Design a protein around this ligand. Sequence first.
Ligand SMILES: Nc1ncnc2c1ncn2[C@@H]1O[C@H](COP(=O)(O)OP(=O)(O)OP(=O)(O)O)[C@@H](O)[C@H]1O
Ligand SMILES: O=S(=O)(Nc1cc(CC2CCCCC2)n[nH]1)c1ccccc1Cn1ccnc1
Ligand SMILES: [K+]
Ligand SMILES: [K+]
Lengths: 99, 49, 164, 360, 292
Amino acid sequence: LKQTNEMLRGMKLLKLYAWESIFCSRVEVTRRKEMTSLRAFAVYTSISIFMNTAIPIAAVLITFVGHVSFFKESDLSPSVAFASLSLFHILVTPLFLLS
Amino acid sequence: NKIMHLSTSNLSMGEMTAGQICNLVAIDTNQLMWFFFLCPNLWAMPVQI
Amino acid sequence: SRGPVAYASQKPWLLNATVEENITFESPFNKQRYKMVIEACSLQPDIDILPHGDQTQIGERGINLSGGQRQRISVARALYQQTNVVFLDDPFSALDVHLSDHLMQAGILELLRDDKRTVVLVTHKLQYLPHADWIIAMKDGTIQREGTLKDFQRSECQLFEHWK
Amino acid sequence: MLSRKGIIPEEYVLTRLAEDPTEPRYRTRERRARFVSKKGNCNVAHKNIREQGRFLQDVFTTLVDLKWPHTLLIFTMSFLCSWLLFAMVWWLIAFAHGDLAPGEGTNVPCVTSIHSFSSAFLFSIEVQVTIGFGGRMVTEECPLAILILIVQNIVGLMINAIMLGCIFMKTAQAHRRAETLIFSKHAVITLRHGRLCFMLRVGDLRKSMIISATIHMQVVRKTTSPEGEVVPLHQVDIPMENGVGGNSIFLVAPLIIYHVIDSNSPLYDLAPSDLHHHQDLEIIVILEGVVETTGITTQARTSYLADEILWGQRFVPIVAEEDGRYSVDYSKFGNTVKVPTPLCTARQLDEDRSLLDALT
Amino acid sequence: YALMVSNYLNWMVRNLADMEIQLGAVKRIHALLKTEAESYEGLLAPSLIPKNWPDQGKIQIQNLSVRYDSSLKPVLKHVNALISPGQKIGICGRTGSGKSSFSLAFFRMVDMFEGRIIIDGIDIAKLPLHTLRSRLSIILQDPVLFSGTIRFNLDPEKKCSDSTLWEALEIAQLKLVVKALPGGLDAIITEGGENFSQGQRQLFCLARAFVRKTSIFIMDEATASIDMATENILQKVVMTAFADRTVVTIAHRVHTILSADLVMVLKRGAILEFDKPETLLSQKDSVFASFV
Ligand SMILES: Nc1ncnc2c1ncn2[C@@H]1O[C@H](COP(=O)(O)OP(=O)(O)OP(=O)(O)O)[C@@H](O)[C@H]1O
Ligand SMILES: O=S(=O)(Nc1cc(CC2CCCCC2)n[nH]1)c1ccccc1Cn1ccnc1
Ligand SMILES: [K+]
Ligand SMILES: [K+]
């Protein structure tokens, strides 16, 4: 932004000196340099969003598989299953805001 | 009020600049306000969990 | 106990607002005084160059002016404050336009003679360095003498012949 | 789901000096405030009203001020509530006496023919509206029922009296009749007998005559005294330029109300140039008088803004003589014709007259 | 699923509001993208039909008029003046309208051009604008410099690596500054000349003229310059007229403009007075009295 503001401040002189493309080359180089960091930021936030979206489903799957196989102490009553689902849905919000 | 009652010595003017103090006011106050907003969460969320 | 002492600085300070508001500086607007001040400062040609004139967003975050123009605005505001004491800090060092400096000097002399108020002009203006006004010499962090203009002539060193 | 926070590291740093509000700026010519409307209904808003229950103290006045549908609804609700309360009281009395129980008639029932809440309600209706079928009679061994009957009769009589009084007071109102008065849509100013005057036409539609007619003229404007007083809406009485000075008039046909603009009149320094829309000028005419039918004073309120004044115009004649009587063409109430008059003010007109007199 | 409905709706509304807020700026950007103009091209073959670089400077104005506001209220009215090829001619006018019109017409920057100009015997509107601006040096009213290496700042487009450019830069002015700068030819600028002499713009223009070998030179008004600066500018103009054989000076200083083959003035939207010799301006005492 500082570089492009410097370019635009003397925009008349740059246009009359036919150096617009010469400075635009450096503008593009700086744009690619910032775009690398922007891509890294996008990757990091994609990972964060994926983890946020996939954590509750994975936890529910693990809980159900463990109860069915390792314990097998109940017939998976709906009164327990849907209550656990509602509790997980409620607890999702505080978990992702505590950080 | 502190700015009004602040010395104008160069030892302080060249240390904490006008831009620096403006950024301080813009950022620190806002983040403290957000912390005040989120203060009930730190008291409630662990208990609820 | 200190009153509203008018002050000027070597580094000009401006308000990010209209030129007229910056000059007034939260003071009542008098058309006669404003016209006299702008005529003394010769700021009318500068206002003509500006698109909105005195309504242009002078200062930072807006229209940026030269050091001489900023000094003109600062001295105009200081004069328009109309205080019993006025301080300056090199008003002519930044802008050395001889005609404008002489006009401002004449206007300040007339206004202060009418108001019978104290005015301090800290500058190296050799054009009006010798005058009937009181003078004070500062060197090596001390005041050499603050009295009549004939004291400098009485001293052996006459300011290196006043750069004659 | 969720969202993000207001984390601003530097607010883009360079994000400043945008300006260009591009505001519509359409509020300059939005509208002009009017003290009163063309049909009365003073458009004045009250604020910071500190009431101490006096609004609800005048219950009868509020009922009278209530419209006919609201009055009917209040009447019906009050009567239904009274009937239901009395029916519930009778039902409770019957239950306490035990006559409600479907047992042998060994004991004399407190009230005869009482079988259910429907029967109790029918008995209450008969008692309060004085129907008296007689199948549900009152025994002589129920003193509490006798006292309740007495109280119910007293309450019913009082309610009937109050409702009749409210109905009579509402019927005595004649504001709708007061609305039948007709005033000129736009007023005119023209010279009369060499003197400038502000003319206005007022007429009535209904053939019923209004007695004790009295018209008051005032000017509402912001006036500042040389002492520095600031009056937002200063009201100054305006004489009618009557032959005797009184405001009493005899209005049968639409008459022309004219005020001679003298030196003492506030209109002495007015010009047609300053007669535009956004002008600090408003003429208020208040007409008072009693109706020959109801005997109740009625008030008519009209306003004339500066843009509503027709400088240099004359009202057309409205009354035409017939073979046996006179006729009034009410379709000509608002028709005016131009009158050639000088454009100078009243002050300039008087100055010119004085100069001509001095020269002659 | 019913319990989540309230929070789902709240988040949906909040995100919709945020999306609309951001889409406002998106629409503003898109509207800004609709401003298509400034087509850099030529209505002719630029391979060999035009001259490689204007050197003779034989340009004849044939009733040329220039206007900005959609060809309305032009600052010139059928301007037809015979320039002097192979020599430096400096036209000075009391009003800036003539200088502005000349500057606009030199690079064809005027919105409207009611006339014809034969640039070195060829049309000006039928030539590449980039090449025309590259082969024509011009100075600015105020000193304007970029922030970067002098080698990449003096001739970024040319990208000439010859040491002759550095020699000319060190010889024209600021020899001590060039010597003190560790980079020298490739020394990086400091915030676009934040702390530099006011002659940096003139030195950069002289270096650009030396590098591009622009025969035609364009000069503008000087806001403020010392006597030494004016003398150096005059010496540079003389050197350009000796080597490039063409120079055009536009200013309001009669004493500076007198050092030219011809002098002309334009005011009130038209040509005021044209003086083929330098002494003709002094012959008409009115302009001399107005100047001083
Ligand atoms: N013949 C009429 N009968 C009833 N009301 C009338 C009549 N003429 C005018 N009015 C009333 O005069 C008021 C002014 O509005 P309107 O323009 O209709 O009348 P006007 O200026 O008197 O018109 P006209 O040209 O008919 O005299 C209105 O309240 C209108 O109802
Ligand atoms: O849903 S909230 O009330 N959100 C909200 C933000 C503001 C800012 C105002 C105050 C600062 C200045 C702008 C307006 N007001 N309200 C909410 C409340 C409490 C906890 C979590 C949330 C959800 N949350 C957090 C961040 N983003 C959404
Ligand atoms: K009865
Ligand atoms: K009966």
